Structures are given as C-alpha cells and as structure tokens.
Amino acid sequence: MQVSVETTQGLGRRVTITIAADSIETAVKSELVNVAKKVRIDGFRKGKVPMNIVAQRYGASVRQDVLGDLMSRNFIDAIIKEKINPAGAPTYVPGEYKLGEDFTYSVEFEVYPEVELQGLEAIEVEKPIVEVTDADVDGMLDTLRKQQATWKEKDGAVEAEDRVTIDFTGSVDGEEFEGGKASDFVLAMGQGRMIPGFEDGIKGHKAGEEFTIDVTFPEEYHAENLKGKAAKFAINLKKVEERELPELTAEFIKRFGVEDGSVEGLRAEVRKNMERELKSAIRNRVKSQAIEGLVKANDIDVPAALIDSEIDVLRRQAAQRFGGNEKQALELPRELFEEQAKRRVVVGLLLGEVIRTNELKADEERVKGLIEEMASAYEDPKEVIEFYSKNKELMDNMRNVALEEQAVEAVLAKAKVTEKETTFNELMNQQA
Amino acid sequence: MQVSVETTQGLGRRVTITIAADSIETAVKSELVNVAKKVRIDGFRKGKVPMNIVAQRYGASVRQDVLGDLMSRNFIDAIIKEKINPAGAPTYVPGEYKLGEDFTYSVEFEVYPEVELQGLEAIEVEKPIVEVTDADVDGMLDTLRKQQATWKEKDGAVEAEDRVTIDFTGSVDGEEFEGGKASDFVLAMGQGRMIPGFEDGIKGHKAGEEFTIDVTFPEEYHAENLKGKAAKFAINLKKVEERELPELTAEFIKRFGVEDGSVEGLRAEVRKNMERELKSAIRNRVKSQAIEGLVKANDIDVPAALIDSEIDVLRRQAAQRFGGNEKQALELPRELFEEQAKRRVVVGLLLGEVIRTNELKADEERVKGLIEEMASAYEDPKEVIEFYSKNKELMDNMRNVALEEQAVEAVLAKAKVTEKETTFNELMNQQA
C-alpha cells in the first residue's frame, strides 16, 4: 500500500490518496467492518448486502465525512507514538468545502526540539555547611507562641498583637483599584499577616479616628497594581479586642495539629520541620548553581509555542495567589510571566536531554521511599500511600519529582562539589 | 476527618463543609502545596511568606474557585473507582452564585443496575448440522465471475450486465426526497447494486427514452423515506457500454486481491471465506436462541438514560449507512432506534452479570488466537498484531469480542444443546 499526505499551509494538511480500484475495493471492506465492530453493529449483520456494494453506493455521500474520521483516527495514533498529551480536546479547524476542488483544515499542535550537554565538568558547586542552633529554635517557638491567643473585649489602647476590625479602601495615588475592598474585615495583629509596617502604623490609634498612612509595597511585589506603589490607607477602625494568653488547660489551646503542652513534642516537631526545609534549602542552592551555570553558559533557541503555553499556566496560577479568578487570568500581562516561562522550558529541556542521553530510569524504589516519608506525616499512611498509587496522574506527576533528584545526583557525581564549613551568620550575608 | 456532601435537587450537589479552624489550618496547607506541585510552582518557593498566612488572606477571594477545583478533582477520583468512562468532557452546569446564600450546580452522569440469572438450565438450543456443497461453490463462483468485465462502447440493445450512465431523480409519490439526486451517474448492471428489479426493469430501453417505472421498496428498508413506499423512476438514459469478458491475460483481470487465473486458488479462497462465515452463521443462531430465551422469559426495568445514549450511537451509525452526515444524525427518528437499543442494553446487562457472577477472566490466550487468524489475512501479520497490541482501546475493545465467546461457552456448557443432522434445503426453509 502507498500513503500520501500533503500540506496546504503551515499546520494545514491534506489527505486524499489516489489508488487503483482493486486496492480501494479491498481497503474499504476491511475498514468499514472494523468501524462497525467498534460500535458493535457487525453482529447485527445477516449479510444480505455485501459491504462493498453499499460502499460504492453511499461512499460518495460520506466521502467528506470519511476524511474527517481518518483525521480523527490518524491524529490519536500519531500522538501515542510521539507521546504528546493534549489538554482536553484538539482543534482541527475545518474550512469551506468545495465540490470538485481542494479542502483546507489546520490542526493545532506543538513540537519539541533537542539539546546538547556541554560544560558539565566545568560546573563548580559550593556547598556551605551550616547548622541550626537552639537560638534559632527559640525564635521559631516564640513566633508560634504569638500566633495563638484568646480574644477579650476591652476599650482603650491597642497592643501589637490585638484583634481588630478594619474597614478600609485601597487607594493607590488617588484611585481605588480592583482589590482592597473591605467590609467588617477582622484582622489578627501580631501575626505578620500584613505588610511589615502596616500593622505597626495603626498601633496607638483609637477605635474611631481616621488617620491615613502611607504604605509602600516592594518593587518585587506579586501584585502588579501594588508593586513599586506607595498607597495611602485611611484606616477608619471601630472594634478592637485584646488577645490574652491562651488557656493552657487544653480548652482553647487544643486548636493545634500537634499535642498540647508537650515541651519535648513541641521541640521535636520544630526540629523535624526545620531540618526538612534545611535539606531542601541547601539542595536549592546546589540546584540553582547547576541551573545557572548551564543556562548562562549555554543557551538554545526555544520555539515560541512552548513558551506561550507556559505563560497561560503561570497566569492561571498567579491569579489564584492574587485572589482567585479562573479564566480571567488570561487577561494578565504576558511579559511578567514570559521571562520566568523561558527558564522553565530551558530547565525542562536540559533535564529531559540528560534523562534521554544518560537513559535514566524512573526508579520505583526512590518514589516509594519519598512517598513513605511524606505519608508518615498523616495519621494513616496506609490509605495515603495507596491513594498515590491509586491515581495514575499522581504516580506519574510524582515521578518527575524523584526523577529530578536522580538527575541532580547524576550531574553532581561528575561536578566539582566542595564542602565548606561556615557559620550560620556567614551564610546570612545575602545582601545582593 | 469528617466528610459531607449534600444534594440540592436531582444531580445537583452541594459541598461546603464546616469544621474547626485547627482542622482548616492543617488541611489548607497540605492541599495548596499539593496543587502547587502539580503545576511545579513549589520549587519556586523560597519560603518568605508562610502558606497559611496567604491562605487566610486570598482564600476568601478564591473560595468559590476552590469549590470548583474540589469538584474537578473529586469527580475524576469517583469515576475511577466506579469505572465510568465519560465521552470527551463532562458537564457540571453552574448556576448563579449569591454571596451569603447557597449555590446550585448539576453534574450530569449515568448509572448502572444489576440483574439475576434465572432459567439458564431451561434453555434448549438446537444446532442444525448442514454442509456446503460444490453446487453452492459454483453459484458463488459465477457471481464473482459476473462482477468483473471489460467496458466496450456500442450502440444498440442493453444486456443484463452492461455499464450505463443514468441521470435520474428520486420522486416518491409526487415529491422529491433528500436523496435520489444523480448527475452523470455511472452504474454497473449485473452486479446487484440496485434493488432487485430496478436494473431489470430498465433492460431493453433505448439510450434516449423516458419510461418511468414503478419501484417498490421493502417494508423493512433501512431508509425510512423509502421503506414501504412505491416510488416511480423516470429513467432518462444516454450512455451504454457493453461489458465484455475480462482479459484473462492478467492485464485487466489483475484487479483482484487474490491471484489471477489460479483455479485451485480461487476455490481455496472461496472455501475459506464460505466456512468462516458458516461458523459465524451457526453460532449466531445458537446465540439468538439463548438471547431470546433470556429476554423473553426474564425482563428487567432499564433506566431511560442508558437507552437514550444507545440511541445516539445507533443514529450516528444509521446516518452513515444511509449516506453520511455527522451530527445531523441527531435529527433522526428516535422510535426506530429505541426499540433495538433496548435489546442492546438488555444483552449487555445479561452478559455483564454473567461475567461478574461467574467472575470470568479476560483470557489473553483467547484474544491472541483470534488476532493471529485475523492477521493471517494480511501480507504481514507481524505489524498488524503489534498494531492491535500498540493501541490500548483496540486491545480492550477486542477483549469484549473474545470475552463474549467465553460467555457463550459458559452458558452452553450447562444448557441443553442438541445436534441434529439436517439437509441444506431443510435449513433454507425460513419462510417466517
């Protein structure tokens, strides 16, 4: 058999294969019965009319539709072998059909490039060795202690950790923005829930005076309408409640996911949480050094399509952390996310090539171990472990996490990693 | 942890679970980071703002969106364990949201019932034993011989197997219908491509005379607009070619998927095709006896939804064999397909319950054997076999074919099957 596929323009495709009647006769019989089996209609055939006879009767009428069916089957077959997973449903975009002339349709799909690994040996990574002191523990403990407190109504002055009701309106330089609209909003002070200085500036004000305070948001603020802006908050005030020491009688203080009062338990829980992120933090710097070393020294021309797709994901996610508005995130500025999107694609391409070139395997043992530690954080690890193994997406999505660890270890094994003993204060010097 | 899900009306569901702040505090942290991992944004977290703090800030704004996300994740999890495969994309149908009040959405999904197997031992099946004679072979051979012939232009009388060009219009009783429209249509006579009598009635007419002949379509004709109708065909005529004996020199006669001229090969190919469908024919009667015995004796109440879905599939398929028109098949009459759809659902339920109750396994050996014989009908069975094993849907879809065979054997093993030697003529008596 002979196969021919043409291209009209860009992503446009054309099928229409011209062959001898004998070949057509044979192919149509086989294909039509195969389609009939899919929907189970062949079993309803008593065989009074041969399939070929009806094929050369109604085949002309469904001739256009057959091309569409072929399009449907060929597309799915092709994406399976090229391993492309479309989001929802693909778009084929059919045009006007002329009888006796050509036909144009454009199937939208993305493509992938290839990369070469160079300068791997030239990667020098410094591993700063630091430890967590008991003083660090004290700071964390104190923060946790100030988080909880029992509310008590009073009238007079305002503390730094009181509970207040603030009706405020967000005005930038002289105009209200989309957010910053409050009504009987209750805010817990002393928890660092607002901008540093915001809950400080309102301290000492009576629950009935309008002051208007200048608050400046950092240039690197996630909200574009607030980043690098110095807004003024009127702050009306009306209700203030004192937060007194929480009842250590397990009455009110039982609002924790950890056991109450247990001094050893509290320190133990802090210790495990601190070291867990310490492990992650050191690896993040190691990972960052490796990533920057590759990107800065070796860049590659990346297709715009892949970057464009990354932007949408970023926009949807950004809107969520700005407030939450599905689909409206589409309206968010492209330039803000396009920069970071480029990095995501480059890193992915770099990792993907390492995996392919070194033919890395998805290690089940590695995945299982990670799951067990993570699942151990819950009361019943048994259902949690099974839950992850229950859903295929979770299994595969989590693989990329474990696989990434393998990729890092592979590079580090051949890279120059030097361990240097440093004081905690020394690593704290991150001024630029 | 406590879970809750309420129902508004019908398929309408309500989430909104009210729990203590401590539980919320813990649950939100775990869930949000899990979502962030899915899109790979957690690796961008340097940890300046605790997740809980932002959660009790923007959580209110995205509160509605969270419910939608929960809806999305819960639905997919639920269908996995209940094993329901949605066609494309599900519909959740959201309504108006009132702040401070309730919310209504309705998720459209189908359900399945269960059946009891009774009266299986009461099924008596007669197996008529017949054979194919050489006379049957001769008839088939002659039919095949008349199919092919070489066209030769002439002027005069018309044979029974000539090649003609007929411009006609389809008028029922006094109105043209949707089809029956021809222009320069070339029809090959003697191949039984038209209604018995249609190509017989035009025999003897000159290539330039309008006669108008009454043609009656059978009551059980697939085309509703023609079934039980006696239409009149004008028949204009203009071009007639004689079909002379095909060149047995392998020139013209090479338009077959079988070797040319080979007498033994021709008979061998006929023999294999005839017995293959003979096997199917006897089993179909056996299957029909068992199916009718169950349906006629034991009826079950079937939900309208399942039947409704079956109707659409039938409509789409019916339109294809009537001509071909995707989506327009929706406009086809329901009653025509609803009757047969009921049978499909009942048979499926009966088979499904047999499979579940008798805990039947999908036998790979059975599947492999069927594939090998089927693939043996192609030049290279190797790629064909791998192709079936390549696509999961083909593998699964084909399993049902093999599994049905197993189900039939299981029933027959305990049913009263009697073999009776019969003459071919005897079985031919199917006059009602």
From Swiss-Prot, chains A, B:
Q: What happens when the gene is disrupted?
A: Non-essential; synthetic lethality is seen in a triple tig-dnaK-dnaJ disruption, although this depends on temperature (triple disruptions grow slowly at 20 and 34 degrees Celsius but not at all at 43 degrees) and strain background.
Q: Could you tell me what reaction this enzyme catalyses?
A: [protein]-peptidylproline (omega=180) = [protein]-peptidylproline (omega=0)
So which domain of life are we looking at?
Bacteria
User: Which cysteine residues pair off into disulfide bonds?
Assistant: none
Q: Name one GO molecular function term.
A: identical protein binding
Would I find Cell membrane among this entry's keywords?
no
Q: Record's InterPro entries?
A: PPIase_dom_sf, PPIase_FKBP_dom, Trig_fac, Trigger_fac_C, Trigger_fac_C_sf, Trigger_fac_ribosome-bd_bac, Trigger_fac_ribosome-bd_sf, Trigger_fact/SurA_dom_sf
Give residue ranges for domain PPIase FKBP-type.
Answer: 161-246
| Location of the protein in the cell | Cytoplasm
Region annotation (Ribosome-binding) maps to 1-112
* Protein name (Swiss-Prot/TrEMBL): Trigger factor
Species name for this entry? Escherichia coli (strain K12)
